[PDB]
């Protein structure tokens, strides 16, 4: 996977670390990734306890996956962003293994929104 990182100000080595960490997420995505962008920003105010902000955006075959984190330095922000992206990709999977427990089962046991409605005759059963 190819990632372009648009940092700002002073963050030496943040671009390379973010690139190498994010590029490892291609195998986790179950569909081809069309685009992947990362942005690193730092808060000017020293009063901020977590100044560094990292944002990511992945185009998973038309499905947009994004996350945003805060950290005290570039490495921690990148690692937390990787964790959040992994969780989002896990929740997006949508392949059969990810939607086999949600497909309605049985015949009369259990009901879901998309469950097949029961067929009813014209006359009351009696």
């Amino acid at each position: 996977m190819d990632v372009d990182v648009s940092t700002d100000g002073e963050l030496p080595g943040a671009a390379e670390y973010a690139r190498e960490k994010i590029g490892r997420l291609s195998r986790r995505a179950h569909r081809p990734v069309l685009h992947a962008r990362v942005r690193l920003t730092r808060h000017g105010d020293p009063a901020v306890e977590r100044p560094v902000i990292a944002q990511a955006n992945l185009d998973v075959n038309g499905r947009q996956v994004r996350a945003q984190v805060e950290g005290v330095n570039a490495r921690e922000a990148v690692d937390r962003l990787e964790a959040r992206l992994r969780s989002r990709l896990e929740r997006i999977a949508e392949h059969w293994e990810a939607r086999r427990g949600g497909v309605p089962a049985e015949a009369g046991r259990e009901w879901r929104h998309e469950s097949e409605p029961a067929r009813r005759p014209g006359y009351f059963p009696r």
Binding site: L34, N57, Q64
Partner: protein, 126 residues
């Protein structure tokens, strides 16, 4: 004499009706030198057809504003109004045909932020 007006989306038509032959005088030009489109001619002569008074009224018309289609529509409304003024008791026939209704369809105002009246700029999620 009698004189009515017809208006159709910025086209204004003044009509002067006299009981002569079926000669069509549109700003000194005939129905063929003007309006060289058969559909426009049929749209013009429809009120005469439904009233069956074809070729018994010399028509003098003043045309300004809009294009050929708007001019034709406003002219048709003008002959409808002139006919309703000449022979009142035909109002059912013209009205149920819709020829007595001014068409309130005008160019929608262009809106800021949109390329056209409703067309919106292309938006990219990725």
């Amino acid at each position: 004499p009698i004189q009515t007006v017809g208006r159709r989306k910025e086209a204004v038509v003044r009509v002067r009706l006299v009981p002569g032959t079926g000669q069509f005088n549109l700003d000194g030009r005939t129905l063929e030198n003007y309006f060289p489109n058969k559909v426009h001619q049929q749209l013009i002569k429809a009120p005469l057809v439904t009233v069956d008074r074809v070729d018994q009224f010399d028509i003098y018309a003043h045309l300004d504003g809009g294009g050929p289609s708007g001019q034709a529509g406003a002219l048709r409304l003008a002959i409808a109004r002139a006919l309703i003024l000449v022979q009142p008791e035909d109002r059912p026939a013209l009205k149920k045909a819709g020829f007595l209704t001014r068409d309130p369809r005008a160019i929608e105002r262009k809106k800021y932020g949109l390329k056209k009246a409703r067309k919106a700029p292309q938006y990219s999620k990725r």
